[PDB]
Design a binder for this molecule. Structure first.
Ligand SMILES: [Zn+2]
Lengths: 49, 397, 397, 397, 397
């Protein structure tokens, strides 16, 4: 839950699962970048956000 | 092994300390360790079982951390804690049953299951917590080669050995002389008998002797030493040495004259006790030497003088006994006793899942055959499996 | 019940941790729980006693909080702490003696005294602390219907039953056959006797059998199994079945041929042991079946052949015994044993204040009559009163 | 004494809690106490030993404080902690062996060694920590004169006294009457015998009685009371009262008619039990009175009627026994039992270093002679030395 | 289990409350629960069956929510509701038939089917609804270990036991004495007969006795107690005890003199009734003791005096009977009776799909063999399967 993550502020976990590359599903209500590019698909842009 | 005890200690404390309505400062140092445990155990997968009828279970850990923001713990926090604790308790139960069931002749002190070999990394080293139980303390002290001591109440140091010895015998079996004994659990009952009641012995005194070697060196043992061994004091018929014929034993009991109980360590007399009964102490020993003797009574009433003739037919046979019961003792190696249930847990796990007989332990976990030939590799395997049994006995009741 | 254990655990820790000169960081998490306890207990009044000679005492709590501003605890803080602790210890002592004395046939697991019914509210739920003792752990696990285990050293699972059985008998009582037994505490001593020594039995073998049903299912029991039951091995005169006449028993002891000890759970053979003595293990059982047999010795020396004629006058009677002693066992229900003193505390409180016999427990707290008919309502009452006895045994020595 | 327990409790916890890889919040309150200990103990010198073969060792403390800046404890911190802990453990080992070896007739509850007299200052009072073990709790409660209780499993309350009493006797020793007993450990085995089997007693009933005074008042004792004392049930020859001649004892066993077991405190009957066997309870007592009687059986089969003639030659002697075994009891004074090893540690230290016999304790630490004459000065010395033995048994395994 | 009852309660109410033309305020609180059910159950897949001939069915839930915008429910809403309800009713029917068919010796109170193990998560916990039926109320109360009671009309507490007992017998079988009984369902019919009609008994009175132990403790039982057992009052020929020969029984009926019906709980007399017939009450009992006696009539007309001679040929045999019928009783454990059909549903599901005999239940679901050995594991399995049978009996008629 991204809302409870925003509330607590201890992180502790998404820091861990982000540094050590562990699969995860962030439940929130984020806005997104729609992106129409195959070069941006090959360059692997989503791991950088 | 250290991290397995740490997992079980935190799960025990988190069943104990994390309750409904308790203050947060009572559990403020436990929730941080439990969160460190969750953070360490996430992303890892385990596989337990695969020997005998122990089923293969796959373990995957994906849990959220516990909240650190309450003042009094409400029932929401208790229910999510009970969920995470029940999953980890099932995991550590199956890891302990996977570790107690395996053994190795080569190096038994090493972890044998795949899950505990995976937990022995430094990635899992931050799980570690206090090591306060006796078995994990002696594990950590013997992992650095220091002196340890397990305190046992009535230790099963003696293998079951009920037998006898005929110092004087013949195929008629009407004039016999020698000792009989029962070594069982922590109790030695010995009785030397003479059928002639030393009527031709020099100075009417027959010397008996019974030497019990131990397998491990006991230390600071309180021992109840009584005379008049009760089991070898009633009439019985006994098979011979070759098992061919049987012979009759009709005892009358004299008191033991000149009892000398010696506690030998490497052949040196550490403690000695001359005609002192009741509770005695033996500070350091691995051999117990009982030296009692039968003296013919020089003054006898007419009710006694008809029992012991000078001629051959002895219908009443002189018998002199002792009883030696180790009440409590400190031993450096692991044993079984009347207080713990760890051997019972090991045998229950090995018998519940129909486990084949391996290279080290006796078939059916025979403790008599395990303490008869108590090799150091079997000692290492027994200590490892007893430590894991103590861990599971902390979690699983 | 949880808050009563919590009160006693904090009072025990505050007698232990709050001492003179100790550092404040050692007691910084205990003083907050003790202040939460004072804040919760103020303004409330209680009334303990009122049954038998237990006197009615009224309890009023008006205390100030303890200071949180020292670095090393000086003697002022220790003396005011000792005052507040002594008042709360007297309160919890009288609440525990008010709860162990009461019982109910309807729902015994519920609190019966007025003080513990008042403490079972959520106003008092913030008193709650860690639940680390074995009895409060099994209380909390059985309050959620999970598996529990009480570890007993020599459990009193057998009611006192010293009796016999004559498979072959007559009013002359000179040619008898059957078993005798002593079931006491954790020890079964059984002995089958034949006066003819199987001189007319088929293949000179007489089969004996002794089946002991248990009241509760024992789990992971270490059991010392020895041959040659010592109590039924000397001559005695015994009243008959109707108590009319007495008959004489002059035993000579053969060894038990073909011992089969079976541990039955719901009629299914869980563990079996064929001619194996020493320490055995029984993982899960509620019935113990001992099947030993008397075989006439085919080769006998002339000292033995005069004992067993083919004719009628048998002055020496063949007798074969076994001894089975449960050293330690894990039982899901509460029992009594040789290690704890909880039954002694319950009987001491019920006998000190001259308490009338209620609907559930036997008169005089007869443990033989309590384990003879061990109903589940009596089980619930016994577990509740043993838990309160464990709490008071923590506080009151 | 309080600071010695505090030193040992911190060293035990710092061997347990300070391990490699553990989180700092698990040990954040222990490192502050251990640093307070280092700060207090620096600059001080001690001298241990100097009696018997216990060597004189000089102790100087110059240590740096431990770091308070890690998140997970690495192996550097563990190794420097193990160095400081090993030096302090050797120090407290030699202080405990210097204190258990000394005694005083004047005031035994005071510290006798120079090191513990130096530790009894208020400079060392900030070492103090929690006092959670049973012996230091009872030490602190008896230092303020409150009620204490030591819980013993099979306490050694009875001195070894195997003897007899002839209520009816003659130099022929063919028609005797009286009691025999064995008081050993926690077990009383008593047996009253009559050779005539009450053939001339009024109403064919002979009354026996056996009164055992205790040395300290036991409280809440669970007691296994069985009939038919097993040791006095087989034939034996026994020396006379003056030791001149020997007399023969050929028992046949009747059951005990009209058993009355009374538990006397100051001559007042606290508990009484009339013909009830199995497990009994005795809430408060210091005298045990067994009153059993031998009744001649009025109906006897022809196998029994040949045993007991009306005339003089009795080849079969009527014998009636009881067995009383205190399984567990709470005693206010210190004792020895089958559970602890503290007496074994005290005797091991006094026998290892060849210590001369002092003014208080018996030569060789004879527990029979120590509980035979159990004076209050000997009680104070025994409690002090057992408390120090418990401290050393915490540190040294 | 709670969510399965909740699914069935909502489907029952939504077949009942959601009808054509009904007002929306009548169903405004049911449609929200049914929409919560649809929202919870979407996206989940289940698999039912797979044992015996029960076919494997896969369940996938993809449904739209029901409308919340009508004032009176029109037929469109009723038809789409009937579609969704019929799919969920078929699902819960197959889940209940998958759960009643399975059993476990280890922990029978846990769900055994895969679908109900999947429904036991907290994701499905928002399905939960009121628990108003008797079986789910007693399920929820025994899940917290409180007292329960099932009210039965004529409970099948007695196993079928039609047998007899000959207190006086011979191979001629012409002068017999003893009791006969029929224990069936809720009815005990007992009849003691004497062929001599107490012509040589002391005071012409023969005492009979019949003790029926129960398996579970009944509470607040209304019992019709009538004299003159009707089944044992006509002439019949009966096989012997070994089944070798047959003997004839020609009864004439006397009235039962001195009827004493006692209701024993743990050997204590709870209720007693002396010569009172009609409807009686027994508040708490698990043993029924009937003590009636046959008295020879001292005054007899010449039509009666020819029936009972003083000599041997008795062509008319005196017989005295009682009948005891438990009309209704409250039992804490589950049973079968003449009111419910739950045992019939369980046996119909187990016999329809040709299910192999498992480890717990008797072959063919023999209720006589199930109540003969009514173990607590079998009790837990029986309660679980009866609760699921009650759920399916709510949905499926
Ligand atoms: Zn013991």
């Amino acid at each position: 839950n991204l809302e409870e993550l925003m509330r607590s502020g201890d992180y502790a976990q998404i820091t861990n699962m982000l540094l050590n590359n562990q699969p995860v599903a962030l439940v929130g209500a984020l806005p997104f970048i729609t992106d129409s590019s195959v070069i941006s698909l090959i360059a692997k842009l989503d791991a950088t956000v | 092994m250290d991290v397995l005890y740490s997992l079980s200690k935190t799960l025990k404390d988190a069943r104990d300390k994390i309750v409904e309505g308790t203050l947060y400062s009572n559990v403020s140092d436990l929730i941080q360790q439990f969160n460190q445990m969750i953070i360490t155990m996430n992303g890892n997968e385990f596989q337990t079982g695969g020997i005998g009828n122990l089923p293969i279970r796959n373990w995957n850990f994906n849990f959220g951390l516990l909240g650190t923001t309450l003042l009094n713990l409400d029932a929401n926090y208790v229910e999510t804690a009970r969920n995470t604790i029940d999953y980890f308790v099932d995991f550590v139960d199956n890891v302990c049953m996977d570790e107690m069931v395996r053994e190795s002749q080569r190096n038994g002190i090493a972890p044998q299951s795949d899950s505990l070999r995976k937990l022995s990394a430094i990635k899992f080293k931050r799980i570690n917590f206090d090591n306060s139980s006796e078995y994990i303390e002696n594990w950590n002290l013997q992992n650095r080669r220091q002196r340890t001591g397990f305190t046992f109440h009535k230790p099963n140091i003696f293998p079951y050995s009920a037998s006898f010895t005929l110092n004087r015998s013949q195929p008629a079996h009407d004039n016999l002389m020698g000792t009989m004994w029962l070594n069982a659990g922590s109790e030695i009952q010995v009785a030397g008998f003479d059928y002639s009641c030393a009527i031709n012995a020099p100075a009417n005194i027959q010397q008996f002797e019974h030497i019990v070697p131990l397998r491990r060196v006991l230390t600071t043992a309180t021992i109840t030493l009584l005379p008049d061994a009760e089991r070898f004091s009633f009439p019985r018929v006994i098979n011979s040495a070759d098992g061919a014929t049987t012979w009759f034993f009709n005892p009358v009991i004299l008191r033991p004259n000149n009892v000398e109980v010696e506690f030998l360590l490497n052949g040196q007399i550490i403690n000695t006790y001359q005609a002192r009964f009741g509770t005695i102490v033996a500070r350091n020993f691995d051999t117990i030497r009982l030296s009692f003797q039968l003296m013919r009574p020089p003054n006898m009433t007419p009710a006694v003088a008809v029992l012991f003739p000078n001629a051959q037919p002895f219908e009443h046979h002189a018998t002199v006994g002792l009883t030696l019961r180790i009440e409590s003792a400190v031993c450096e190696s692991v044993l079984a006793d009347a207080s713990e249930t760890l051997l019972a847990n090991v045998t229950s796990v090995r018998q519940e899942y129909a486990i084949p007989v391996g290279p080290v332990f006796p078939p059916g976990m025979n403790w008599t055959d395990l303490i008869t030939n108590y090799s150091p590799s079997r000692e290492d395997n027994l200590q490892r499996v007893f430590t894991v049994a103590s861990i599971r006995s902390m979690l699983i009741k």
